[PDB]
Design a protein around this ligand. Structure first.
Ligand SMILES: CCCCCC(=O)OC[C@H](COP(=O)(O)O)OC(=O)CCCCC
Ligand SMILES: CCCCCC(=O)OC[C@H](COP(=O)(O)O)OC(=O)CCCCC
Ligand SMILES: O=C1CN(c2cn[nH]c(=O)c2Cl)CCN1CC1CCC(F)(F)CC1
Ligand SMILES: O=C1CN(c2cn[nH]c(=O)c2Cl)CCN1CC1CCC(F)(F)CC1
Ligand SMILES: [Ca+2]
Lengths: 493, 238, 86
């Protein structure tokens, strides 16, 4: 009955709740009641889309309050108690869940994580030591899997070693994949669905292991919190291709078998689509190395910053596609009466002598797309007859499209990303560290502990001490910031 | 070896040939070191240095691009390598008048993918003698995707990276150019070289005594003049 | 046995040493003790890679202190004596 009053009252109440002083006075667990408010406000800023800025700002101030409240500690064991309170680092996992960025890029927490990571130089020594482990990972994994004792069993269990082992396994996968196309192991093309080659055998275990790992991960997540990471989506679509390849290759194995020449095969022969799908799967499989570089220090931030500029390009390829559609729909009308195809050896633009480009809608779309990179020669816009007026109007439209889509629209893409880079680059490390920490925490458990090739009262006292720690932290914070920093503001009338 | 045998009929790896090639590369590097002479100028110096600084902002990028290139080459080789034609052609590869058989070997595929950047690879490469008009389409699709990624989405980001870094660097231009020029000068102040390469073939207690007085004067002037005088120039507070 | 305390203590001590006032009071050769601290902090900002910003900033302030200490001269021969001393 009163929209304005209701909305304003809601905003006032929420701003009242999210104030450091009030939180410090009347609250049980500052950290939780900060996370909860941050999440609730952030999500609520979506359903209401007029006061967006205020809600975003409030979430941000909650984030910074939580970070600064964490900062006031002066004891390692203090910190570990804070991060452990609820099998290890449960609260930090909670923070990761709540997308609480600034709380995790804290130098003390980072030292703790690093110390628990390395578990005990210079780049030459690190290089030789790193490369050494790959040349021996299989027997090491064997030692764990057969004799989980404190001779070699613990050595893999150390995280950094586990990461090195998995990297080495993945490099082996790519090497075998790349070796798949050698004529030394490709005995003969002319055969309908021959039995899998040797390399085709060695690949299969890696496919099985990857499938099982993704099954475990999706069992944990269940399409929720799993699909969001675009890398997982890529993994899903990239696994499906391999599965389809196996199934279809079996189909071809059982239907057809003969020594018929490669040239005289009809389209949609199962082996052909099998090869094509396998190749696309190879591209996606190889393309996932970039995700390995978040663990480096020189490339990490750069990789993330490239990661952020995709909603700044996808919102643009759409407009360009719309323009392309309009112009193709135009140029088809003018020409489609001149479909020549009078006994030519080939047809289309994908030929040595380009001809008959502007005939069909699909062909026109192809020509318009390739025109961007200057791979379409000019004499296309020409007809066998001498109607030297349409030949001019067609060239005019083609030129107009080139101007619009290569001098007026692309430069605006450049001038867009350019401005966005400064909006993003300011927040580079604060986010890179969060990504790297997530990557690390993926390894700290006894969950995977195996490369994919070889994949087949109690708390009253804790509350007692935790409350004392909380009291000390909140006392230090209240005394040291909301009092001490107030007496540092400029004068007024 | 010593004979008057025609140039055309020499086998590969003939020593004279590699000698000429190595000599030429040496000529390129030898000639390329003139840029270092221009730090002694005043109009070009700062500019030369600023170009000098933007190399860790590009080498950290060519790496990513090389990775993408490797992935796509490894892809396109699988689709095609069954169609290695080489049926009595006069030449072979892309480095020929009529491009043919580009996507056959891994090395050849790498060459084609690299040259594709500058638009020197004609389109009819992705075509086979037979009429399997499905693979001919998937190959073209991958080729187009590579071109989009590596010429409209990745290079513009190189531009937008160096652009932002230039303002981080340009602010400190002269303060660094002068240091470089001074090093260049101090390379000459001694009686060490004194010849062009063609024609190349108590004592200190008193000093301490005066130096200490100079130090005392300087530190007195500094303490009086900055850490005192500039303190009484700060804005008010609560 | 105490990583946090040790690191923070190291940082506090190094920030204490690199202050223009303290250098001017108790030091023999300001110029050297400035160069040495600059180099030591700059290189130390590499082995420790969490407090990098503080160490870089400290090295920078040492640099600017050295420059400004040089600046306060009003005699050519004064300058030449300063630059020649070994
Ligand atoms: C820049 C105009 C130069 C005039 C050149 C000319 O007369 O040729 C007509 C050109 C096309 O050239 P032709 O079709 O070969 O005549 O039309 C345009 O591209 C206009 C661009 C429209 C851009 C909005
Ligand atoms: C911009 C899309 C225009 C559609 C044109 C078209 O249908 O042709 C398919 C094109 C390639 O053209 P052809 O292989 O000749 O069909 O595929 C892409 O390049 C997609 C780019 C993928 C970029 C991520
Ligand atoms: O990311 C995937 C997804 N996987 C699949 C699944 N199915 N198909 C695939 O091609 C791939 Cl890569 C399993 C392998 N890794 C790599 C992991 C270990 C090595 C790394 F740290 F570098 C990056 C993470
Ligand atoms: O820099 C070289 C390295 N040299 C070599 C050594 N071996 N091979 C070479 O081609 C070169 Cl240039 C010797 C010549 N200079 C040039 C110096 C004098 C002239 C200059 F002030 F312009 C720049 C410095
Ligand atoms: Ca995954």
């Amino acid at each position: 009955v009163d929209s304005l009053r209701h909305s304003r009252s809601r905003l006032n109440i929420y701003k009242a709740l999210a104030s450091p002083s009030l939180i410090a006075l009347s609250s049980e667990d500052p950290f939780l009641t900060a996370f909860q408010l941050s999440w609730e406000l952030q999500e609520l800023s979506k359903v209401e889309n007029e006061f967006k800025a205020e809600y975003e700002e409030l979430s941000h101030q909650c984030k910074h309050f939580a970070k600064d409240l964490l900062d006031q500690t002066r004891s390692s064991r203090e910190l570990e108690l804070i991060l452990n309170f609820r099998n290890e680092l449960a609260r930090l996992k909670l923070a990761i869940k709540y997308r609480q960025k600034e709380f995790v890029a804290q130098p003390n927490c980072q030292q703790l994580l690093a110390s628990r990571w390395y578990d005990e130089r210079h780049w030459a020594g690190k290089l030789i030591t790193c490369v050494f482990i790959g040349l021996m990972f299989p027997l090491l994994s064997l030692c764990y899997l057969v004799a989980p004792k404190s001779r070699y069993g613990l050595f893999i269990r150390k995280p950094f070693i586990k990461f090195i082992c998995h990297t080495a396994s993945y490099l082996t996968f790519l090497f075998l994949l790349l070796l798949a196309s050698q004529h030394i192991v490709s005995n003969n093309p002319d055969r309908q669905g021959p039995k899998p080659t040797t390399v085709e055998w060695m690949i299969l275990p890696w496919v099985l292991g990857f499938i099982w790992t993704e099954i475990k991960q999706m069992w944990d997540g269940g399409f929720q919190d799993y699909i969001h990471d675009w890398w997982n989506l890529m993994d899903f679509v990239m696994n499906s291709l391999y599965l389809a390849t196996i199934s279809l290759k079996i189909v071809a194995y059982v239907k057809y078998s003969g020594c018929k020449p490669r040239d005289t095969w009809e389209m949609w022969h199962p082996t052909l689509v099998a090869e094509a799908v396998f190749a696309i799967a190879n591209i996606f499989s190889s393309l996932r190395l970039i995700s390995l570089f978040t663990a480096n220090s020189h490339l990490g931030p750069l990789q993330i910053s490239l990661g952020r500029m995709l909603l700044d390009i996808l919102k643009f390829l759409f407009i360009y596609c719309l323009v392309l559609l309009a112009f193709a729909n135009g140029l088809n009308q003018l020409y489609f009466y001149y479909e020549n195809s009078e006994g030519m050896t080939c047809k289309g633009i994908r030929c040595e002598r380009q001809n008959n480009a502007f005939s069909t809608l699909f062909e026109t779309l192809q020509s318009l797309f390739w025109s961007i990179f200057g791979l379409i020669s000019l004499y296309v816009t020409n007809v066998k007859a001498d109607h030297k007026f349409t030949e001019f109007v067609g060239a005019t439209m083609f030129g107009t499209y080139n101007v619009i889509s290569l001098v007026v629209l692309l430069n605006m893409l450049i001038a867009m990303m350019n401005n966005s880079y400064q909006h993003i680059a300011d927040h580079a490390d604060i986010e890179w560290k969060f990504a790297r920490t997530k990557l690390w925490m993926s390894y700290f458990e006894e969950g995977g502990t195996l490369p994919p090739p070889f994949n087949i009262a109690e708390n009253v006292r804790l509350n007692h001490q935790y409350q004392e720690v909380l009291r000390n932290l909140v006392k230090r914070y209240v005394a040291a910031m909301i009092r001490d920093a107030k007496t540092e503001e400029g004068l007024t009338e």
